[PDB]
């Protein structure tokens, strides 16, 4: 994917979600030329800007140097914008003619970016489809979460963007998803003898999924409450997570293979009911600082009286052979002590302790960010003139996660995008959840900012039967 | 074992072996008082001599400087010498009254120190057994290697010095055992369920003991002849590392225990034929330096025509249900290319390969010496663009052996000491090989002076099925 044009088509150039994050992202991609070296990049959105207004709002966030000014004006001389409203044919048509209008624009590989606002996802799909395709390239698309609310509306949206598009041109993204360890436990888990056949009920105890942040919701708290913790990355990164786990031998892995691992393991997850499931939120730090002085409900775009909760503990199981009865967990949230986001490997003890009750549980950890590192904390006896053991870690084991997996989109590897039947599978979970959601409106634990989370969450993982030291 | 008395009887102090690693080693465990308070040394021998001449013969090897020439002094303080021949009981009595004229002799461990010539062993045990007994405290002995030639001496003598002492007052004492790297199997058999359920025969494919040597027998070629080095080093210390590495349920640590497990084990493999030996033995360099300009033939000392062997390579297949048809490989030798002692717990592959055959056999390495280390090569993706495993090393991990081992002679740790039961099976496992061997006089394949060994211990390996990469 080095050769042939491409066009990434940022729809919705003024919108801050691209000013703040994707613009600077294909510029760390293009000063290092990562993205091919015939990329376009094609901005829209519904306000008449120019390339000089992006470069005047955009180029704080860009950070470049004097250095190279010289390489941010060569990122610009690839750059364009369209004016145009979000669910009319002619500014549609006038877009398609712009892309036409450049280097094999129609021969260009359309890699739209959707990061316009939700709740138009369908006629903009709708008109993308109907007028934006080329007939020469791989048009791919790129839904940014989340992908309905429950169910049914989940469904709709699903079969509309399948009658559209194939599996082969949708990308659904998750922006939060490392891809780098992600991507080493998979290495660790298949290539080893040492860690294969003990990947079973008997041995691994539990699977504890974790990713937590260190800042709140300032500014957009606007956006966080008809959506959800379970809907943004906990139904999505950790249910990735989850089935990156416990996914059976791919025998293949390619991308439809894991990905229809994950389909097999999801559909062998029973209905789970409020009974493994709990929920936090976050409340003004008493030891303020500049941003934690205030919580979730002190920001004042958060409608008052909003149940909607930013901790979310859900327990799942298998009911296939391999991983028949044991359990796994999930465990997200923001605002939270320390960034973190880890996959903690609990084993069972071995059958029968002559250490005199020292053997600790063997864990294997995956901490994605921040400074990743894989270790395994495995005990060994301690040098002197003794006997004992001591629990030790281990350690075991580059462009940031996003620019990653936009490089990824680009390749083509759909490995750690969510599949339509995975997405239908992981709603019909969680449906009993989500109805009783939205029916009654649940009232989250608080918790206090920049803390360990509710304490129901490792009472959940006692339950389950993660030992804690 | 720091309050009452001790004694290390030395018996052979003008001896070439007390006077160059028992005495040096006795003085380094005293500089640092690891021995007790109130120890003491009585050395015995043939020859009249006196302290201060032990002091002019013995000083030079101690490699001490005038800031510890104190404590040396004071080393020298408590020693000790008593003249008398060694089948006499006049002397023998001369011996047991100088013993008593001490502080508190009769009370005190004699732990006595068979170092004298071998060809003794059996007046020396029972005048030793007859009269130098004290009935008050533990009068362990320490019988050096080897015990007896073949299945009918070693049984008889065996006999005899259970007999005489229970198997609480023997120790078939291994120079070359480490206590350290040994003792970290353990644990990291035990502790771990990462390596604890597939301790088996699925899963581990084969397992590789080695002991390498780079400097031969100058000199000292007069005593490696009569025994071989099956005798020396491969049924001692190879078996033992044969039997930690595949004892089935240890139970408590405890040296009955996991002697009894030895046991089990060695119960558990049958006859070795002679389908199951490689041979070898070493010659000069013509490019060496120092001693490796001359051979084992080149030495003076050793009788023309002699077949004894210096490498020595002979699989065995323990017999039961968690071992069942598992290789499980010994070499050993000396003047090879470089000093080692590990064990290689070559795994099996993973069944079904996806990441296109670049799945190497695990392995778990347990460096005794030089620079003890355990390291177990996994493999695991190294960072980059492209799905790819890479094999890692990756490390897991004080007096020297031969102190720690005096040292388990003084506390009472029988773990590391090879019984008489598990001798006699050891001994009936290699009856029909030894017989052989005594009866043909095999010639072993010549191989190169601080080479890696015949080529034979190589294909043997590949035989059983282990794999070089």
Redesign the interface.
Known sequence: HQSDTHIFIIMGASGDLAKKKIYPTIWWLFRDGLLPENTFIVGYARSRLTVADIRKQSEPFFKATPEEKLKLEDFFARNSYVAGQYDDAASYQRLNSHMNALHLGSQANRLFYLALPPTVYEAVTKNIHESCMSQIGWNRIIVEKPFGRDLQSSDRLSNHISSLFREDQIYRIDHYLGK?MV??L???R?????????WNR??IACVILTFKEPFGTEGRGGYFDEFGIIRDVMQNHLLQMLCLVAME?????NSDDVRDEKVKVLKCISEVQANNVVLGQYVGNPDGEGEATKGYLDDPTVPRGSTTATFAAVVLYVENERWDGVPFILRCGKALNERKAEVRLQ????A?D??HQ???R?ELVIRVQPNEA?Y?K????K???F?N?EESE?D???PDAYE?LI?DVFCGSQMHFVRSDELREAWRIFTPLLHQIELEKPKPIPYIYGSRGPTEADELMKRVGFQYE
């Open positions: 780098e991507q080493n998979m290495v660790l298949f290539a080893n003898r040492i860690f294969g056949p003990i008997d041995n031998k791919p025998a293949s892995t084993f069972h003890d071995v029968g002559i250490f020292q053997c600790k063997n894989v395994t495995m005990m060994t006896k040098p002197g003139m006997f053991p281990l075991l084991t580059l990653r490089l």
